[PDB]
């Protein structure tokens, strides 16, 4: 919960250190403190008003390194601090938060595709491994609804997946759910009201503009209006009852486009542009900081 849409890292020619924040209320962008280490394919999440950047990879000319890092950004100080690292590097990770605890899901390390899952306890600054998923998944979308964690699509190393599964923390156990109608790796996955949305992604042939949503009560996936741009490795968040998708790759260009989905009207609209095109960002929402620089 909060007021700005923060976008951390990403990729354009090489992995990026940018931390920028968009204010839907006035259309303004702020540049904040860079990440300590560039990273794309990371996830962002917020707990207790702090922004966490999780996993990813630094794709650079001086060497490509998969990240096990968990770093914390304090909007009150405009500073990043390192937290305890995960058990393993996880590029193209998915992350969700249940009851103040951060779940790191899947992702890759070199040629290995993780089924493993681990949980962060901020109060103790400690990671612990939980039950692994039923399927190895990288480029996996993750969202939380009703204190259950969902892992949606991805890539197992051989095929892009339409499959999805759901984790019950009290049983430390994953269960398959209805697969999506479309195979999607690198989709934006997020929750709006009673529904898990999976927007865009790559089906192994094309970047996608289609968007489908899972109703947890009916156990079905239904397509809604498609986005204006096909995009994979997009950033996604929810703010005041609307979905926002940020950047991505459309098979031609690294997008700067930010689109807003209104569920009331079932329409996607262009709302703003990032200061530069990029894919594989981590995105989350929290309170405004105090001493940034406004982007002209």
């Amino acid at each position: 919960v909060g007021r700005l849409i923060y976008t951390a890292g990403g990729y354009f020619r090489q992995s990026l250190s940018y931390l920028e924040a968009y204010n839907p209320s006035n259309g303004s962008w702020l540049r904040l403190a860079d990440l300590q280490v560039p990273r794309s394919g990371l996830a962002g999440c917020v707990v207790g008003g702090l922004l966490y950047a999780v996993g990813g990879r630094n794709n650079s000319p001086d060497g490509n390194t998969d990240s096990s890092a968990l770093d914390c950004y304090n909007p009150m100080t405009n500073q990043w601090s390192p937290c305890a690292s995960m058990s393993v590097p996880r590029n193209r990770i998915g992350v969700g938060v249940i009851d103040g605890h951060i779940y790191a899901v899947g992702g890759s390390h070199g040629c290995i595709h993780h089924s493993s899952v681990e949980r962060y306890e901020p109060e103790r600054d400690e990671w612990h491994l939980v039950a692994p998923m039923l399927t190895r998944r990288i480029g996996v979308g993750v969202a939380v609804l009703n204190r259950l964690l969902y892992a949606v699509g991805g890539f197992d190393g051989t095929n892009r997946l339409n499959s999805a599964e759901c984790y019950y923390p009290e049983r430390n156990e994953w269960r398959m759910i209805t697969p999506m109608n479309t195979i999607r790796s690198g989709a934006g996955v997020c929750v709006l009201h009673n529904c898990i949305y999976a927007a865009g992604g790559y089906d192994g042939q094309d970047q996608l503009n289609s968007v489908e949503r899972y109703d947890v009560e009916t156990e079905t996936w239904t397509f809604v209006a498609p986005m204006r741009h096909h995009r994979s490795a997009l950033g996604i968040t929810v703010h005041q009852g609307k979905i926002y998708v940020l950047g991505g790759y459309d098979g031609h260009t690294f997008l700067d486009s930010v689109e807003c989905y209104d569920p009331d009207s079932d329409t996607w609209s262009e709302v703003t542009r990032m200061t530069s095109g990029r894919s594989g960002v981590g995105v989350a929402v929290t309170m405004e900081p105090c001493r940034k620089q406004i982007d002209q």
Binding site: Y11, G41, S279
Partner: peptide, 6 residues
């Protein structure tokens, strides 16, 4: 990888 356009 290719969804990032890497």
């Amino acid at each position: 990888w290719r969804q990032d356009i890497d």
